[PDB]
Ligand binder design. Structure first.
Ligand SMILES: [Cl-]
Ligand SMILES: [Mg+2]
Ligand SMILES: [Mg+2]
Ligand SMILES: [Mg+2]
Lengths: 448, 138, 448, 138, 138, 448
């Protein structure tokens, strides 16, 4: 029995120190929602293989997770929202591995539970206060870049792979000079037989400094320090530092501990730390199993990364805009307010942890800028693909069109034009003084 | 070349009416409003000269616009920018910053390469006008 | 167009150097399997935002993944198996982050593809040859333990949490003395307010040495070195080493780079390295998205861990026995032969990488030993929960029953008794000379 | 106490017929078969004395059983074990090892605690019989 | 002094017919052909300005020659070079690079010696024309 | 018996993973070629001192080298080509010492074999994939130098020895300024009573930077870091690095392990690594014993050096041009095709290892440039001796003549002139605008 073993407590009162989780539970055909919740609770805590004297040597109750609330998923008769409470003393301070191990690991249910997704977490203030939060954060990153009141612009180098150091630097230089604030290594580009990492870093720095001298702006290139071992990541991070890079990147696949290690390094060495997280990882459009991205957003803001890809509403990624708005809030706000439509199940105080910058990447172009400003706000990095590199007039020109479109939309937003309704005419008034933009707009309206 | 520091530097230079509408934005955001100027246009020159103090609790753009034009008259061969500071908790910082005057001509920057260990280079940029004293610039 | 852009090549000939992936693809309602495969291929390689001059500066074709074979999933009209080839030069040698980033990251398909699971990988010999493989491996681990011809026995400390160092060591000592080869820290037990890690390690070592002096065997306790940063993991690993521990453990949630870093440390310091991986992680019983566990098994054997939980067939985890047999083969064999029923889609030579030991954990007891020996073989660690700690006669006694049952079944296997059919009578002949086993057998036959 | 090194040491001592059936197993696994003996029963004593060489290419358990009993007669107050070595590629090692003789009485081990830095201890175990010369043991 | 970056810079400046024969070479090597120009002639200035994109799949030297002469007209007081890029696997890089225009006069470089630890010196070279803005060079 | 012990297997099938060797075997007067091959095979593997029980504890066959093919040397009745196969698992990954120890060490034959030379090796792809290959490589070295489409020019300082630091720097400066891309330390010049190494390095750097400021080119001087111990080599390497040298050199006599150590250092510190190997070492024009230079070329490309002296066809070294062409291919090509006339006995895939630059050194002058371009190609460093220093007009002038002759020949090659037939008229048209070359050509045509 699980409901009778302590694990189900409808009368439990949550404390300000509890860690809370909301699971979307799908119970075994002919099993009770209460027993299902209880199972999930009892598995992610004290595993009852029946009768254990050694429990009575400890304050047993304290270590047991409590299923305290179950609601039917509205619009789905067979799925339930189970709310579970965990005592703060179960968790290692400052450790994402320990948090994730504790919650999504122990949580079984073979006989009572058919499917389980983690939807949201309420990390209590005193727990959050044990984490560094973003190495830099939005406010500091903007002070370092001297860039205020607009989204930042970036793109990945095209092609992803195959360019030598020198031809790679060429792209970086053209794009930066043309208008972009940042260029980036692809998540795949680490160190490979077609190009090892040291020459890339060396030519990139030349490109970046050339571009700053040609524009009078701070410029950056996300040098990918992702590697197989920590010592190797440190070596790559240490060259970015040495050469004066403003920014590096890491791939979420390095995993939690390497991320925390890197977040602390970026804090200690004045480096902006961009995290790459695949928008369409095979582990994507689930309703059944896994964990929702909002939970990743909470943990990564706690770990201490400065940028993470959060989604668009439009373009190629077909997001529910209100769910996305919910990911942005998680990343940016000092306090989150429950709002079921955004998929935020808990109020949450962020304990003055710094802000992470959302990144919008994926099939976006200059003709959607009104929708992009309207859905995503001004604290965002917008990343355009062959939206820049494949301008018929050159990479510089592609960059210029994106940058003009952005400034023009922000100017109209600030003037209080109904830029969502009048967005196309706004872009067309801008293109009038800007041939590269005129050329950009014609291209993505004729068919594509 | 055109220096592209500033929120709107990829747009044409702002007219007085456009400038007015941006002051209105800042007013409704409840920002302090500062006017700063410089003729050392290095991207890491964080501290331009202040033209007066920032204006607090502003309700009418006209006094802001008057000081912009007074600075334009006193300092026409300088960069002049308008900055909006937020005092909102967890921001406490500039949230908008745009050019309202540029010199008639920008010569740009020199790139210096000091050769270091192996293939690494230590870089400096030096604005050409800074090779001259302040009163001879632009 | 994706099928017309190079990405679909039905005539492609795979090379011995190619990295191959098999995805289970579910195409968008009214999209073609060929276009779906092509999309997956074209996303996990050169992202075609249409027209990019810079491609012509590189040997473009080389960097493009090839969809080369599509089969309808037999028993599922709407799902397809897409086989994709990747050139070896795309991949950083020795890097799991790079492999996983390359394959499951870039792989999108918003408009053509509804769902995608990675089912299997063919890592080519020359690639595998770039990885360390298990720090110790099965053969060496058995030479260090002086334990041949039988599964090893372990259990997790009960309760998971709350015992002080001294009462924690007590359990470890009783269980080891009673018969178990190993005791383990729970994956949740790192360092927490109820117990910090140094005192645990210190009392555990006393227990382990007491148990060796009481039995004349090598004994071990998996000390969990899981921590938030690399320096912290190293500190914990360095105390296990200093105190003479035979074995440590890490949680898969530390992530790939910390795992590789730890695998190299365990190789260099003569330490057996057990990896904890949740058998029922929310990311479990999927048919739709994610990646199949056999792929994790390949990557972890390459990374270099010595133990990983691979499943049971029986007990609480309701596995398809033939799929499980497939996970074991991945871990243990020097060569894998395609076998669709086991879910192995490729032949694969393991390039003389050492063997990883499967761990069977989860609702198993001494009365199923015949099924356990028959399904799982002799190279396995069998972990029994309150199957030991909650014996009415004591922890020592619980350990003894499990150990006798195991030896008795292996003895009958070696005598060529049809131990699967006559398993209950075999256990009953053993219990005749063993009261603890008699007591164990009565308990799990009366009801449970 | 009972020393529980060996594959079957939690079972009662094996009869000659049980021993015969284990030799048959090894024969069908195509193992080399060795007989080793010791009266230093430390778990890290990797090298027991060999009673003759291992037997290769064996087809009949009787000659194996004869040598086990000859060792039992020559060395009755010793531990005696039978080892099966595999030459299979990627194994090349013992795959079975079991006791076929124990001394009549086992006194066990001494635990030595040498106190080291802070709270750490360096441990040794010493089999009690090893405090005596070989010919006085058991 | 004469700057000797370039494959043929120790030869006299190439005539249009010599230039034509080098384009033919690149065509038969199946190279992409780029035209780049600069008036910062530092040897570590890896990135000259591109005059248009590189020309791919070229079969007739005339359009290449036309763009060389158009660049010569627009940028006569610049260095102008022609680059041939190979996409051949395991090369993927420039395999020829030669000057097709030099300024009428080259002043050369300044050598800077920053004194460091013991007797070591950190060196920079600075092209003299780079002490002036781009539009005042040569 | 050796042919009857397993070592001769005419029916053996080579695998893609085997390491293969081709020995030129001269059997004892009145011994059989089959027994001779077998002896060589059986000596470089499991030494049969007759009857060894301990073999049966191992997969014995695996460790035995197989003589699998014997051919009579065409044009030599008494000599045979023996082809021997070795399993990949015999070899330590990444270790030249282990490879050379394994192959040319164990290989005896007192009673059956009179003389033995190793002619060629087929290193399998998966083995090659375990080595770094060139620290820099040709493509990257040219990107760093900004030098494309022509050979590079160098010379050794004359005299070899005796100049003070300051007078030594003088020569370096004159030669570099005059046209040469590189100047070099002699292999003999390390650190000696007439000149210690630190002052040399310090004055050389001044010369090199003066020469770059006088030409607008990247200039280099091979600073010799050769020393008696590793710590000493590291100290010398670390000063070259600190002072900003583009290139260092080492002598092949430091030996394999110091070479690998240095190759890894040059990769990690962005340094071109030139290897000096004596063209006429006493160990030179053999047909009987030793190993052929093509094998050294394979191992050094694997170890990771960036330049090695490969020979000329003409000048003072009297090479067979087709054998030399074979050394160049070994160094430069991504795949080697069997070609008996070039002395390449195996096809070989280079597994995307970087290219080593051949160096042509030895009694060459500006009047042979057509032959040099024709035999050696454009990826080569041509080193001229007193061909530069002993120009009657000065070192600068000597350098200029060599550089003009080179550019003029490459220009004629690109124009498709039959530069081999019309080479003298090409040089004479160049000398018309170049007095230093006119003077050079008159000097080496009047007598010498
Ligand atoms: Cl400095
Ligand atoms: Mg991204
Ligand atoms: Mg486990
Ligand atoms: Mg040489």
């Amino acid at each position: 029995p699980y409901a009778k073993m302590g694990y189900w407590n409808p009368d439990y009162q949550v404390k300000d120190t509890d860690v809370l989780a909301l699971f979307r539970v799908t119970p075994q055909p002919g099993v009770d929602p209460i027993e299902a919740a209880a199972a999930v609770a009892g598995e992610s805590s004290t595993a009852t293989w029946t009768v254990v004297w050694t429990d009575l040597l400890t304050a047993a109750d304290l270590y047991r997770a409590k299923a305290y609330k179950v609601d039917q998923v509205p619009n789905n008769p067979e799925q339930y929202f189970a709310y579970i409470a965990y005592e703060l003393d179960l968790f290692e301070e400052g450790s994402i591995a320990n948090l994730t191990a504790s919650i999504i690991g122990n949580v079984f249910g073979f006989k009572a539970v058919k499917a389980l997704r983690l939807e949201d977490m309420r990390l209590p203030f005193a727990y959050i206060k044990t984490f560094q939060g973003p190495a830099t954060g939005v406010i500091l990153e903007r002070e370092r870049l001297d860039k205020f009141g607009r989204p930042l612009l970036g793109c990945t180098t095209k092609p992803k792979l195959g360019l030598s150091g020198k031809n790679y630097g060429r792209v970086v230089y053209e794009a930066l000079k043309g208008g972009l604030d940042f260029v980036k290594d692809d998540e795949n580009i680490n160190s490979q037989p077609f190009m090892r990492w040291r020459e890339r870093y060396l030519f990139v720095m030349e490109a970046v400094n050339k571009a700053a001298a040609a524009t009078g702006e701070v410029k950056g290139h996300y040098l990918n320090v992702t590697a197989a071992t920590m010592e190797e990541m440190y070596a790559r991070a240490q060259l970015a530092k040495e050469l004066g890079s403003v920014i590096i990147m890491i791939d979420l696949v390095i995993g939690y501990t390497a991320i925390q290690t890197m977040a602390k390094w970026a804090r200690d060495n004045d480096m902006i730390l961009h995290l790459h997280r695949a928008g369409n990882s095979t582990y994507s459009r689930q309703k059944n199993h896994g964990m929702n991205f909002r939970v990743i957003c909470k943990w990564m803001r706690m770990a201490g990364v400065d940028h993470i890809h959060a989604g668009t509403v439009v373009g190629k990624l077909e997001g529910d805009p209100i769910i996305t708005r919910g990911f942005y809030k998680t990343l940016l706000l000092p306090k989150l307010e429950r709002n079921l439509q955004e998929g935020l199940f808990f109020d949450m105080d962020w304990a003055s942890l710094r802000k992470v910058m959302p990144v919008a990447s994926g099939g976006i172009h200059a003709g959607q800028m009104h929708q992009l400003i309207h859905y995503l706000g001004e604290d965002v990095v917008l990343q355009f693909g062959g939206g820049t590199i494949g301008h018929p007039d050159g990479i510089q020109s592609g960059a210029t069109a994106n940058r003009v479109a952005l400034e023009a939309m922000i100017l109209a937003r600030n003037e209080n034009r109904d830029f969502l309704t009048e967005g196309p005419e706004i872009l067309r008034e801008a293109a009038k003084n800007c041939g590269a933009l005129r050329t950009a707009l014609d291209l993505w309206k004729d068919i594509t | 070349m055109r220096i592209t520091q500033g929120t709107f530097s990829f747009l044409p230079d702002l007219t007085d009416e456009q400038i007015k509408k941006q002051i209105d934005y800042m007013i409704s955001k409840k920002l302090a409003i500062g006017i700063e100027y410089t003729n050392d246009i290095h991207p890491r020159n964080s501290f331009w000269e202040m033209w007066g103090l920032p204006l607090f609790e502003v309700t009418d753009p006209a006094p802001v616009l008057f000081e912009i034009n007074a600075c334009r008259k006193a300092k026409s061969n300088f960069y002049i920018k308008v900055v909006g500071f937020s005092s909102e908790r967890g921001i406490e910082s500039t949230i908008i910053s745009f050019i309202v005057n540029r010199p008639k001509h920008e010569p740009g920057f020199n790139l210096i390469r000091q050769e270091d260990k192996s293939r690494s280079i230590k870089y400096s940029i030096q604005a050409y006008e800074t090779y001259k004293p302040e009163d001879q610039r632009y």
